[PDB]
């Protein structure tokens, strides 16, 4: 249909206990329309959820489909991200559903919680139509048990545990993505314009971290670079997906017949134009390589990029 949706008020907000793995982690959540004003969202996250404004914002992007990372790279990515987000009062933005890079962020948070004190304000922004149980969440403000067991035959995905807060955006449909990218980017833009406690005039710094990826990862990277305030991004080489494409394009700055990877619609369809548009602003793109170059720590790579 032509987006003919009933604009009923919200009927899902509260706290959920993740019954499942060997943890008891609460997660405040709300459901909001995909057209809400970020001022209200910031007011909710600051006063109702009682979170201080961040000194740093980290946006994590990646492939939606589940992938795997080789050892000795995930243990230096997860620990680096955790150190960066722990030593600094920071908010982490993630997809939220237990697929792709979000699984890696989840197990990174799982490994840190069993060895160190403190908490990380991980925030999940997932579409409401992809949660495996739309029911068991339509209760009002009350603690709801939630199950982390995943059924592969359900053709959906479960919320990733070890997330502090959830923003469940809905547009009416059920079973397809695309109801949170606009809201997530608009909230990031609004919170970047927010003023930090320093009276210099500088706002909250925003960094982007790319693991694995897809055809749209190039598009969101170019959107980050083309914003009026440039947003530095950090990619990785050991993933093998479009992040590795960006890493290879970092080398040999300014070889076009190499675009055939059996990855898109043959050589007829190519993202080389937007890849070169990204590479035209290469002082913002960072990269991380194990042993080959400097900055062998992710937290060092993130902080120096800001």
């Amino acid at each position: 249909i032509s987006k003919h949706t009933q604009l009923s008020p919200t009927d899902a907000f509260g706290t959920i206990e993740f019954q499942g793995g060997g943890h008891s982690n609460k997660a405040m959540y709300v459901r909001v329309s995909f057209d809400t004003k970020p001022d209200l969202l910031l007011h909710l996250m600051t006063k109702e959820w009682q979170l201080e404004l961040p000194k740093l914002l980290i946006s994590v992007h990646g492939g939606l489909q589940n992938f795997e990372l080789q050892p000795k790279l995930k243990q230096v990515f997860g620990k680096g991200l955790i150190k960066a987000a722990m030593t600094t009062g920071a908010w982490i933005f993630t997809g939220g559903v237990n697929t792709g890079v979000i699984r890696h962020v989840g197990d990174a948070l799982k490994d840190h919680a069993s060895k160190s004190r403190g908490k990380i304000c991980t925030i999940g922004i997932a579409p409401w139509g992809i949660v495996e149980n739309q029911e068991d969440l339509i209760g009002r403000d009350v603690v709801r048990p939630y199950q982390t067991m995943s059924n592969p035959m359900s053709k959906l995905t479960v919320l990733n545990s070890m997330h502090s807060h959830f923003i469940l955006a809905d547009n009416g449909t059920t079973g397809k993505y695309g109801a949170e990218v606009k809201l997530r980017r608009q909230l990031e833009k609004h919170i970047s314009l927010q003023k930090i406690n320093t009276r210099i005039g500088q706002g909250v710094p925003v960094v982007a971290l790319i693991v694995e990826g897809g055809p749209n990862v190039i598009s969101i990277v170019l959107e980050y670079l083309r914003d009026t305030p440039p947003v530095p991004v950090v990619v990785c080489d050991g993933s093998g997906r479009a992040s590795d494409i960006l890493a290879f394009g970092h080398k040999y700055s300014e070889v076009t017949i190499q675009k055939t990877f059996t990855y898109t619609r043959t050589q007829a369809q190519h993202l080389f134009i937007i890849l070169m548009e990204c590479m035209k602003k290469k002082e913002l793109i960072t990269v991380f390589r194990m042993g080959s170059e400097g900055h062998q720590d992710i937290d060092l790579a993130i902080l120096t990029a800001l």
């Binding site: 019954q19 499942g20 793995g21 060997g22 048990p145 199950q147 982390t148 067991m149 995943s150």
Partner: peptide, 13 residues
Amino acid sequence: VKLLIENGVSMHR
């Protein structure tokens, strides 16, 4: 028991 608890089964059910 610990491994199964970490892998999905909740004792409440």
